[PDB]
Amino acid sequence: TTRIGYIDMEYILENVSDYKEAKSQLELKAQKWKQEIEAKKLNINSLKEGLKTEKALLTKELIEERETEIKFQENEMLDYQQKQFGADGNLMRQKAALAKPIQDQVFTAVQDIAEAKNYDFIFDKSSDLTMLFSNKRFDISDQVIRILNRPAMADRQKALDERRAAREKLIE
Amino acid sequence: TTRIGYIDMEYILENVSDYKEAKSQLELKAQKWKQEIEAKKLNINSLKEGLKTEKALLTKELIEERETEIKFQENEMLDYQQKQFGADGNLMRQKAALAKPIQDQVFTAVQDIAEAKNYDFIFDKSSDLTMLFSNKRFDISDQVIRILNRTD
Amino acid sequence: TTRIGYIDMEYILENVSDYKEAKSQLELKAQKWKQEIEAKKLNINSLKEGLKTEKALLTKELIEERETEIKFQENEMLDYQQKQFGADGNLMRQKAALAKPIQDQVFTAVQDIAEAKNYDFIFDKSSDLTMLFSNKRFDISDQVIRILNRTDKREQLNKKQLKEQEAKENREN
Amino acid sequence: KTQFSVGKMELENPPSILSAYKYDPITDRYIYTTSVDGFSIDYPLVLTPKEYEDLLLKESRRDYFRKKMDAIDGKKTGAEAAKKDLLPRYYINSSLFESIFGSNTIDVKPTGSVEM
Amino acid sequence: GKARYYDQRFIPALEAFNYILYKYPNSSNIYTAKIWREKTNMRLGNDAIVVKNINQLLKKTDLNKQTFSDANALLAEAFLNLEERDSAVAKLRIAEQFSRINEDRARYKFILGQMYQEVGNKDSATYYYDGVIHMNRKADRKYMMHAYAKKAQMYDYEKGNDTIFLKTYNKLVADRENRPYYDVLFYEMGVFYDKKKDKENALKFYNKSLGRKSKDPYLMASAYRNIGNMYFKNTDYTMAAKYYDSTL
Amino acid sequence: LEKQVPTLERLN
Numbered sequence: 001t002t003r004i005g006y007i008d009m010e011y012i013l014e015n016v017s018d019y020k021e022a023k024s025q026l027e028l029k030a031q032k033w034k035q036e037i038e039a040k041k042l043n044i045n046s047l048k049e050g051l052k053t054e055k056a057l058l059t060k061e062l063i064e065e066r067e068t069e070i071k072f073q074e075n076e077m078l079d080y081q082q083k084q085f086g087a088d089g090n091l092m093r094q095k096a097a098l099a100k101p102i103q104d105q106v107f108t109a110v111q112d113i114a115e116a117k118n119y120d121f122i123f124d125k126s127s128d129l130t131m132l133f134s135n136k137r138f139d140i141s142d143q144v145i146r147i148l149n150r151p152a153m154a155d156r157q158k159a160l161d162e163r164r165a166a167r168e169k170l171i172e
Numbered sequence: 173t174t175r176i177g178y179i180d181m182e183y184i185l186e187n188v189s190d191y192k193e194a195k196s197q198l199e200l201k202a203q204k205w206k207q208e209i210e211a212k213k214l215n216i217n218s219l220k221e222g223l224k225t226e227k228a229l230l231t232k233e234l235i236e237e238r239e240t241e242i243k244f245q246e247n248e249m250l251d252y253q254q255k256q257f258g259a260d261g262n263l264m265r266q267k268a269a270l271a272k273p274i275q276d277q278v279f280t281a282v283q284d285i286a287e288a289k290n291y292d293f294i295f296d297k298s299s300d301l302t303m304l305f306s307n308k309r310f311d312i313s314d315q316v317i318r319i320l321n322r323t324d
Numbered sequence: 325t326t327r328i329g330y331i332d333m334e335y336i337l338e339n340v341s342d343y344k345e346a347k348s349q350l351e352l353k354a355q356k357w358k359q360e361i362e363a364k365k366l367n368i369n370s371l372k373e374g375l376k377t378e379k380a381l382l383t384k385e386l387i388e389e390r391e392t393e394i395k396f397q398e399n400e401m402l403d404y405q406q407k408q409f410g411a412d413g414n415l416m417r418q419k420a421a422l423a424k425p426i427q428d429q430v431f432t433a434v435q436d437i438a439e440a441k442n443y444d445f446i447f448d449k450s451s452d453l454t455m456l457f458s459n460k461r462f463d464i465s466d467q468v469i470r471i472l473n474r475t476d477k478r479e480q481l482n483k484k485q486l487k488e489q490e491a492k493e494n495r496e497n
Numbered sequence: 498k499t500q501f502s503v504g505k506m507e508l509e510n511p512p513s514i515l516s517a518y519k520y521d522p523i524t525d526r527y528i529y530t531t532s533v534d535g536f537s538i539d540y541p542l543v544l545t546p547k548e549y550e551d552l553l554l555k556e557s558r559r560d561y562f563r564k565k566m567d568a569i570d571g572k573k574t575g576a577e578a579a580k581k582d583l584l585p586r587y588y589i590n591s592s593l594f595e596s597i598f599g600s601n602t603i604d605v606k607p608t609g610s611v612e613m
Numbered sequence: 614g615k616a617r618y619y620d621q622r623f624i625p626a627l628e629a630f631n632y633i634l635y636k637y638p639n640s641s642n643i644y645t646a647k648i649w650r651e652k653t654n655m656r657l658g659n660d661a662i663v664v665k666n667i668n669q670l671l672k673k674t675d676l677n678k679q680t681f682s683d684a685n686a687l688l689a690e691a692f693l694n695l696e697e698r699d700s701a702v703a704k705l706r707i708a709e710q711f712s713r714i715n716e717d718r719a720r721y722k723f724i725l726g727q728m729y730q731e732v733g734n735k736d737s738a739t740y741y742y743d744g745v746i747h748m749n750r751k752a753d754r755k756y757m758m759h760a761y762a763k764k765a766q767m768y769d770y771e772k773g774n775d776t777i778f779l780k781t782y783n784k785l786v787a788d789r790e791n792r793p794y795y796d797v798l799f800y801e802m803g804v805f806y807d808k809k810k811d812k813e814n815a816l817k818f819y820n821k822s823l824g825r826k827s828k829d830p831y832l833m834a835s836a837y838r839n840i841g842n843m844y845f846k847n848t849d850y851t852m853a854a855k856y857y858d859s860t861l
Numbered sequence: 862l863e864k865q866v867p868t869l870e871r872l873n
């Protein structure tokens with residue numbers, strides 16, 4: 001009265017092209033952010049070199065003012081890095097936005113199969129919790145993939161009956 | 173004959189107490205500490221660059237003391253980072269003090285419910301990575317929440 | 325309905341004597357490596373003190389050679405420390421490889437137990453925190469430990485015992 | 498309808514974002530840092546020996562089990578290489594299985610002439 | 614398991630041996646599986662466990678002579694990894710005593726001689742090297758020729774008889790069966806003449822060893838370096854530099 | 862010297 005199946009999301013996502021496209025888009029966005037940060041680093045290094053080339057000529061007040069300007073630029077860089085790659089913003093949001101459609105398709109397929117087969121829980125075989133044994137007939141990964149990408153005597157007798165029916169129907 | 177339930181630890185934690193606001197405050201403090209560490213790293217790098225610029229004018233003796241000062245600053249930053257962000261202390265200790273009494277109370281309530289109602293397995297759905305789908309009929313978190321609220 | 329069993333890998337590893345002895349030997353080897361690192365540090369400090377004591381009597385070239393030798397010794401010590409105690413160093417890699425044969429034996433025993441007793445799923449309870457409450461009736465860890473001890477302390481049957489076993493198993497035909 | 502409690506699936510970090518453990522011998526600690534180009538994305542996690550060791554052993558055991566059952570299953574794009582280090586009890590491969598004849602091809606051909 | 618072991622894939626080999634010990638209690642290969650599991654563990658760096666388990670097995674098993682020798686060789690290797698020279702020597706002595714394969718016996722006697730020479734016991738080292746020599750054609754000639762080389766290394770330069778040594782090694786190096794090892798012999802002779810302060814003969818025999826084209830790079834390098842040192846100690850630094858360039 | 866040639870070029 002309580003049935004459990006498993007999904008093995010790694011294998012399923014290996015068979016979805018949208019997953020690879022989303023990974024490529026995320027990598028492209030990360031590269032764009034890295035290029036912007038590198039441009040800011042180049043500007044800051046140019047400012048540092050400009051201050052260094054005159055550190056032995058001007059007085060202390062000008063040196064201190066230029067150092068404060070450099071520190072302000074570095075703080076602006078740190079703020080930009082925390083905004084782009086930080087723990088909240090423009091990377092978590094981008095990841096969630098890219099993963100929302102794939103999650104929608106995969107979870108719609110999984111929910112359809114779970115409702116059809118009356119499963120109460122659907123574990124993930126590729127998660128942190130490891131199953132050393134699985135009954136292998138509760139694995140619904142192949143059915144999910146098919147949905148996304150869209151007693152030998154008895155078998156022999158069924159094949160013979162199907163052949164007879166097909167041969168009878170084809171000629172008439 | 174096998175009876176299985178599950179709980180959502182995050183949902184119970186948010187319902188019984190003001191866990192979200194305290195967690196957000198702790199996250200803000202941790203971000204402030206991380207920014208302080210980054211500022212210390214920037215200051216150390218600036219000191220290293222300044223020492224590198226002035227080497228000929230030095231007697232190799234003030235160079236030694238400047239290197240020791242830089243090493244002292246680096247060690248101070250490292251010990252501050254370990255104290256604030258160690259596996260035990262000032263972030264993990266604060267998070268533990270935030271979520272440990274309620275976690276122990278939830279564990280005790282879950283054990284009591286399991287013994288009384290003869291549950292065989294109680295799963296924790298809070299990870300959201302394992303346990304992708306749950307029937308929500310084998311959900312005992314309202315019972316855990318009511319048991320927690322019964323205690324003052 | 326589904327039948328669920330589980331093991332506790334930490335418990336199983338705790339109840340295996342050879343694993344504990346191997347871990348102790350690994351700790352002893354790590355202590356020996358730390359002593360070697362301390363000896364390297366002592367040599368480096370002796371070189372630095374020797375250079376400092378007579379730094380005035382040396383020319384610039386000789387000072388440069390002594391400083392390069394000290395830097396080479398320091399870099400060698402750092403390389404040895406990273407190679408032995410790094411995140412993927414000798415110590416950590418050898419620690420991770422200790423339980424692999426035990427994991428193989430546990431996996432085989434779990435497959436056999438789940439075949440024998442009609443278990444649909446067997447979980448590793450210690451892999452994550454998903455399993456909050458687990459009834460001890462479904463814990464097959466002690467059975468796995470019994471199996472592991474049985475294969476560890478195996479004994480070859482005698483000629484009389486082998487003949488008796490052949491006669492017993494040949495009674496079907 | 499059964500009103501499922503849906504979990505979640507998320508993308509992993511792009512390869513440009515490194516995430517690694519570094520051993521600091523000055524304090525004898527292991528620091529986990531997730532950085533893009535040296536900028537710590539989250540809080541560093543510094544642990545003692547026997548604190549890094551427990552987590553490393555846990556993840557290594559999990560990875561060993563996962564790789565073994567991935568090799569057993571076979572449909573994971575890389576399980577064929579790992580099948581060699583498997584116990585042959587857990588899989589059957591057809592490369593060393595042959596039919597009554599080595600293949601199903603028929604190649605017996607005639608050459609010459611016939612006269613009436 | 615054996616094929617995986619000799620392929621140096623030790624974890625799967627151990628898995629196969631453990632499966633033998635787990636699934637087949639009525640098998641007649643239980644002791645062979647145990648010994649193979651122990652040597653796989655030794656290859657995995659568990660020498661203390663290997664010593665414990667092999668001692669347990671050898672306590673009451675009265676197993677076959679060849680497997681007894683194999684177990685003692687495994688014990689000797691495990692003790693070597695534990696840095697216990699005396700235990701390794703005793704175990705290798707037992708393994709050589711109980712061995713039935715002539716190649717293994719010659720290798721074990723050579724390793725025993727090497728152990729005693731490393732410790733400094735030239736009497737026992739000479740005993741075991743002479744034991745290798747006494748196995749004349751029952752084993753590979755490399756063991757006998759290198760035993761002669763190591764006997765030359767342990768020559769007593771204060772009280773030893775130069776005439777007997779010279780006649781023995783001249784007879785050795787004027788033999789057709791010893792050609793593939795002439796270099797190893799020639800170098801040794803040069804070393805002898807190097808330590809008797811006879812630079813002409815030392816240079817001649819070093820040159821002979823070099824002209825033998827050893828195919829072992831370190832023997833060629835050692836001969837070049839020894840000639841370079843002979844020239845350096847003679848205040849001839851141009852030739853010393855040339856020969857150092859040669860050995861580099 | 863080559864670090865101060867640019868500021869020599871720079872004027873006003």
Ligand SMILES: *[C@H]1O[C@H](CO)[C@@H](O)[C@H](O)[C@@H]1O
Pocket residue numbers: 697699700701703
């Ligand atoms: C191996 O055996 C030697 C002598 O047999 C001992 O001295 C050693 O301590 C180890 O037990």
Ligand SMILES: *[C@H]1O[C@H](CO)[C@@H](O)[C@H](O)[C@@H]1O
Pocket residue numbers: 734736737738740
């Ligand atoms: C090795 O063997 C020689 C000859 O048997 C002994 O004299 C020596 O003391 C060591 O035991």
Ligand SMILES: *[C@H]1O[C@H](CO)[C@@H](O)[C@H](O)[C@@H]1O
Pocket residue numbers: 774775776777
């Ligand atoms: C070795 O001994 C012979 C005589 O036995 C000597 O003639 C020779 O010079 C060397 O001393």
Ligand SMILES: *[C@H]1O[C@H](CO)[C@@H](O)[C@H](O)[C@@H]1O
Pocket residue numbers: 855856858859860
């Ligand atoms: C080093 O020097 C020796 C001297 O003869 C050469 O034979 C060798 O080829 C290398 O040039």
